[model samples]
Target: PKEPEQLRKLFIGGLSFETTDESLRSHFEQWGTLTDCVVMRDPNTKRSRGFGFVTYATVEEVDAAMNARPHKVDGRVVEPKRAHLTVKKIFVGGIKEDTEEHHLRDYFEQYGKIEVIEIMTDRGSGKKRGFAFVTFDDHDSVDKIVIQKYHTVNGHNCEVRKAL
Candidate 1:
């Protein structure tokens, strides 16, 4: 898969409750190729959560959308902004004891620019503690990750949660 450009991802906010994935795409389709589009929803009820994200294929495409802002979707005015980095970090749990920082960097790099990866260890024994923290340079990277809930690192099922 191609690396996601820093500015290609956009946060679509103020979306109407009625907005659907197709409707969101239709509104932004004129500006660029939507590499990915979706309306966030409740896992159980599957109803629109009143916001979504749209990922364009290129910085040019994203720029076009931003330049042509003041968007309206699903009969309501919506907001769109570039997904920027904001010192976002996530806690990665249940990693294999053998997993190392490099292993995490390779796996999490797909989301966005990784600033740091810290695999925790027992200070007394200097051994793996089965968890780590991944810090992404961009807020969108963390959003992209936690939305999926689970990840695999080195053949082990790893879980991600927002770092408090």
Candidate 2:
């Protein structure tokens, strides 16, 4: 409920395929008092989703983890970044892996003026990871985008949602 300048939640990626809740908590708790720690798993396989989320008691805790990246757990380099906390921003997924900022901006700007748009990219390869974030100057675009569910650009299908 707190949308302060600094976020207390984090999106942790590149998790060990075998990671579990207990393992994640143990490693991340070193940073601060964790309100919740999760190692996301596939419902059918019950295996790691290759990512997890964690909520800290304070923004300071989030900072500690962000500073520790590229964190290595189980010998795999992991990324910890401040989670998006606003509904005014919408997340886009299923986009082309080669998405570009300007091209993406052209589409969403049709709904409303865009403040900014960022395509999620692979840290090592510097290529799109097939997702993006669009912040609208008008909150209306954010609301409209989420209900639309999907967008098609360059023959690519994109999933939309409020920033998680």
Candidate 3:
């Protein structure tokens, strides 16, 4: 397997309000296979948030897409940015209120060496908000942890987003 940096995910921003998933998929398909395409929208109004993610299977594909779509979108010129994907931190959510930083560290340590573990707590109640930030020494370890056991922690459904 290649290094974590070799598998890059690009964040697409400034999408037109009318853009759809299919439009993005079609536009980016000219570059390579798009593993995932998402257009974020407001939950209530269901309107585009002007940003989304386009995940390519390989770094080469990501590079091609970034180069080809730098400023042109469906004949309407627009700016697009290429962000290298890296897994320096993991966001663990749906934790118990009593979960502590040490507990999270111990739990995640089974996967790899943890550089930092922080459990966010409510300021007023001092109770865990069921979320935490876990930092790892290497991006590969973070990817391993996420791919192998993302939802197995504390029986909660955790999500792993590559930290910026």
Candidate 4:
């Protein structure tokens, strides 16, 4: 029942100004089923912004499209890359000032494998900043935690958001 739409989305670059949304989809659809496709445009002139985004139905399809690279569209070779916004790191804000790494682990480990937990500290006082950064080994884990919106840590409610 869980699908990681964040990872399914991709960046399309080097597109020709003449390219249209459907034309872009037609180029990538040969590799996999696309859930979303678009050619960015300027608000005033309604001209191509020279870039677009394509979303695949599954992670496997993302691989298929990427592996079949050097894509040509509208008489130009366009670039396709994994979107940077789909990173595995998350920012935990409003955490208890006294909270430690283990304290966060106890509350967050249930979601997935943790790669790193950084408890932010003041540069001068060395005191906890009531915020931290958490990294997970898998994309799905971060997605699961972020989808919940908030988490309780050290008896305090903490806000969670994508770090990027």
TM-score of 2: 0.48
TM-score of 1: 0.54
Off-target runs (Cα >4 Å) in candidate 3 are 2-7, 84-164
TM-score of each: 0.54, 0.48, 0.46, 0.51
Worst 10 residues of 4 by lDDT: 140-149
Question: Quick one: best TM-score, which candidate?
Answer: 1
Clashing pairs in 1: 85-138
Between candidates 2 and 3, the one scoring higher on lDDT is: 2
lDDT of 4: 0.84
Worst 10 residues of 2 by lDDT: 140-149
**Candidate 1 Cα outliers beyond 4 Å, as residue runs:** 1-87
Task: Report the poorest 10 consecutive residues by lDDT, candidate 1.
Answer: 79-88
Q: Deviation in angstroms for 54 in model 4?
A: 0.6
Please list the residue runs of candidate 2 whose C-alpha ends up more than 4 Å from where it truly belongs after superposition: 1-6, 84-164
lDDT of 4 at 107: 84
Give the winner by lDDT: 1 or 3.
1
lDDT for each residue of candidate 1 in 1-164, tens digit (9 for 90 to 100): 65456557888989999888898898888998998898999999998888899999886687677667678777788877667334489999988688888889998998778988888999999888999998876565676677664698888998898785
Error of 2 at 102 (Å): 30
